[PDB]
Ligand binder design. Sequence first.
Ligand SMILES: Nc1ncnc2c1ncn2[C@@H]1O[C@H](COP(=O)(O)OP(=O)(O)OP(=O)(O)O)[C@@H](O)[C@H]1O
Ligand SMILES: Nc1ncnc2c1ncn2[C@@H]1O[C@H](COP(=O)(O)OP(=O)(O)OP(=O)(O)O)[C@@H](O)[C@H]1O
Ligand SMILES: [Mg+2]
Ligand SMILES: [Mg+2]
Lengths: 524, 523, 7
Amino acid sequence: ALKRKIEAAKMPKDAREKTEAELQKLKMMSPMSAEATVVRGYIDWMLQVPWNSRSKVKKDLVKAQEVLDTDHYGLERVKDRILEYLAVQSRVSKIKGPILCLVGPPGVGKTSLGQSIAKATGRQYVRMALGGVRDEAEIRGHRRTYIGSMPGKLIQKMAKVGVKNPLFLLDQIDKMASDMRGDPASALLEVLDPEQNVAFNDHYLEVDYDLSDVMFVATSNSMNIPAPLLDRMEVIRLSGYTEDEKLNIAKQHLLPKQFERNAIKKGELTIDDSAIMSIIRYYTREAGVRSLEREISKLCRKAVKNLLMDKTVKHIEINGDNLKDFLGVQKVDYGRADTENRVGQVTGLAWTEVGGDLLTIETACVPGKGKLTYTGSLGEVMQESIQAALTVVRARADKLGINPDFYEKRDIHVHVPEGATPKDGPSAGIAMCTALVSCLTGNPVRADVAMTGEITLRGLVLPIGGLKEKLLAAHRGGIKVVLIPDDNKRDLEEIPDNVIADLEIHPVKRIDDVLAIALEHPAF
Amino acid sequence: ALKRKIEAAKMPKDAREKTEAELQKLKMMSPMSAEATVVRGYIDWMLQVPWNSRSKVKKDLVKAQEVLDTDHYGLERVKDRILEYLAVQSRVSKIKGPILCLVGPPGVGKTSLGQSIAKATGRQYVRMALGGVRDEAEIRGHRRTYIGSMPGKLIQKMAKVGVKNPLFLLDQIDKMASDMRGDPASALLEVLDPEQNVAFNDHYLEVDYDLSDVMFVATSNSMNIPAPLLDRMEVIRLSGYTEDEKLNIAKQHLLPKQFERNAIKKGELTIDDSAIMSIIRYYTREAGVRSLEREISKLCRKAVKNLLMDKTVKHIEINGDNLKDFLGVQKVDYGRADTENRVGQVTGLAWTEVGGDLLTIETACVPGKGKLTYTGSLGEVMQESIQAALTVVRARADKLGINPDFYEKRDIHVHVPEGATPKDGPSAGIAMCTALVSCLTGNPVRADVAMTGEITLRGLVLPIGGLKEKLLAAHRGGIKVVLIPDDNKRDLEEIPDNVIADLEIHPVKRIDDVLAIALEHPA
Amino acid sequence: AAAAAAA
Ligand SMILES: Nc1ncnc2c1ncn2[C@@H]1O[C@H](COP(=O)(O)OP(=O)(O)OP(=O)(O)O)[C@@H](O)[C@H]1O
Ligand SMILES: Nc1ncnc2c1ncn2[C@@H]1O[C@H](COP(=O)(O)OP(=O)(O)OP(=O)(O)O)[C@@H](O)[C@H]1O
Ligand SMILES: [Mg+2]
Ligand SMILES: [Mg+2]
């Protein structure tokens, strides 16, 4: 019978009481009846749930750092989170399970990371895919009145794993189907609630089951999680990869994996760093590294077919010069510094989600009747930034050498060259003010200076967002001097030493410093 | 009886433990009861699903290219992809199987290309149409609580085909529904995940099922796919067909199968290159070949009824002059070059998904009060491009010999005479500038010159997209010399040889190079 | 008599 299993499973109190009550209710029924299948199946579910079986969580931080650095590169803040968990777990047992949300663009290593933690903490990996899930019964099940009643994929995966310390990876929280017919994202408000998981009532089990030590790591692409559910999760925003990070990921983790998936032998293929960097500069324009391993896999695969169909060569070196012969023609390109100091042209810094880029900001000031025209598919905040720049110039028209009646005598065209790409933002206002102080004075803007900042009518420079990708975009070009806002100095502690050592980074307070540095002849 | 089926169709560990635990649960049930039917349904659904059966993937690359060239013409990049798959598969016993997204205009043969691939690789063929599909339970199914439940249609097709190495053809992956009520595109985000196909957990068969060797090939018409799905697929762009390869598809593939579909013998109907190229030039206006084979099929059935109703003429010969006797009035007309050098008009190069076309751009500069009107169903980037071009002419008007107060004294009207067709993009911008200079000087633009490129206020020419159909449109139109930007020289590496041989192609860097080449007199 | 949940 079952009482050696119910006694053998050292349950908590109320689960043992309901389980034994269903046992002595089971031993008074006909065994070939349907009620014996309901109660018998209920006990057969109650015995499989891991009521107290645990997995021994690791304690060495150096070896766990070596596992996290073994499987992935560079994701420093999540590895810090796991080491802090293993430290506080190393001091006491039965901690609350950490509830995390990984938020980033596709390919930054959110789903593949959730197995590495399950090897670094010594937990057991388990994964639920929540993309497009609309049924709430995948989380809370049905009651056992119905015919085939099962306790939902949480209790099914706890019963399949067999311990009460797993690592649930919840893929695509932000892709759950929210509707009046189906909303399982609010059924998770009991599942991951940091002070209510100790009594998670299931609709099939009917007994409170402890989920407090289950480690919940969830992955999402955005912040469109409902705010009752987004508040319960410690959110780590995995930003996009840089070029040195994509280089080291591509040469420490992607080349051995794609050599192994294509069975490349030792002296058979050699892809150096210049070809990898040419893939990064010239063929891929993403934030992740999945199209990067597409191009690496295409290099290895074309090497396999060329060696199999040539039979005379036995070594292919792809050195970035013959990369064109394999991947095809160069798809994309990045922006570079100009080589000559020009009058109505400054170098702006822009940021998008795949990285940073340089902006050209061109002004033409023709003798006219005061018409102001702004082209380049500009947003409304950028147009307001040009109007603020013109107000700064018209307020300071005397001490800049500008004829103060140019608002009636000069037509001004402000154009940003890639007119097919939409652009919006408060930044590059000191850039547009610099390009308007020039071409009203004939002062050329020096070509090795990029700048970013938001301007006020008093002449101040306000902070901006994302200095790291902008300083990498300026370092990738021929920019040598970067004018940043003053209160963005607090970002300069998270910049690599190459960018700090190469760029001459000036923080500025007011527009007179910007015009003092970024003009060939002093404005004042 | 059932446990010999479980041990016969040998499973992995978790499927065997779940299925034998399910049968041991079935052993204490009455046979005619509802829970017994749910358990038996889960058991025979676990028995129909293949766990270990595969297919011998081919190894000969020459015969595989013979099959791929037997079914389709051209399409060298996808055929390269399939032969490279067969090379790596020839070296390795089991690899992950490619996830491909074929993207192109309709009629370019990406649905039939899948069955060509499944024939050329030895893999079994499975098709699933995703056009307009809104329910996410077509992919994952429902729990076995529900009455009449079953797995997703993917698991049903895997259980139908019997092997774990099929070719899935995901038809219309971009025409899937995506709203709050239905989102199967995020349900495909697990099954197209290149790392997590080893554990595909659907809702009926709640065991993990391995899909890390199924070849997924998806077909779509546009890049209107969610960015997580686009990142999980390998995009192959199938561009439109040229005149020579439509001639070769028609001669090598369309004419023999439309002869085969109409019982036309070898000595009844003959169609030469003049009729085929006349259909391509004057009846189709497409990117695919589907209206082309509709015109060919129309010729064949008219030939059939002309062989039945007459029965004294027994050989019909269709060529370039008697197509209107069968097909009728020419539906379309390609753009042609102009014959005289005319003040104010230029010929930009336009490109749509149907193909490249010539783009006449004209300007009138009448004496007035500086009015600026721009007609011709222009976009907003196009009108900003004309404003930038006019600023380049205006800041350079002393060098060009132009009276610099023309912004006060003369009214300028830029028009593109197609009218009803909407037109957008900066690629006409250089052309705009040239037209304005002509219409301010009386110096006519020579009609044998086309041009393309983006303009900046400095005067520089920036790169543009899609040179191949623009140069094919200039070669079709009778242009003898084009003007491309400088940094598009690389795209000249993938142009056919007759187009390079006929066109005098000049890359330009700035605007006075264009005004030096494209105008009749020196500026 | 036994209840059964339909979708
Ligand atoms: N920092 C890294 N180091 C090494 N490999 C990485 C790194 N980041 C990503 N990868 C590789 O990217 C591949 C897929 O990553 P993963 O599926 O985790 O991305 P993701 O962030 O989950 O994307 P999505 O959110 O779109 O699902 C993995 O095979 C992994 O090896
Ligand atoms: N290169 C080619 N060689 C031979 N036949 C071709 C070629 N390209 C297209 N076809 C023919 O065109 C027809 C249409 O192709 P198919 O329906 O396979 O894809 P498609 O029309 O692009 O798909 P969709 O309708 O989804 O856009 C097919 O019957 C095919 O035979
Ligand atoms: Mg993922
Ligand atoms: Mg199709």
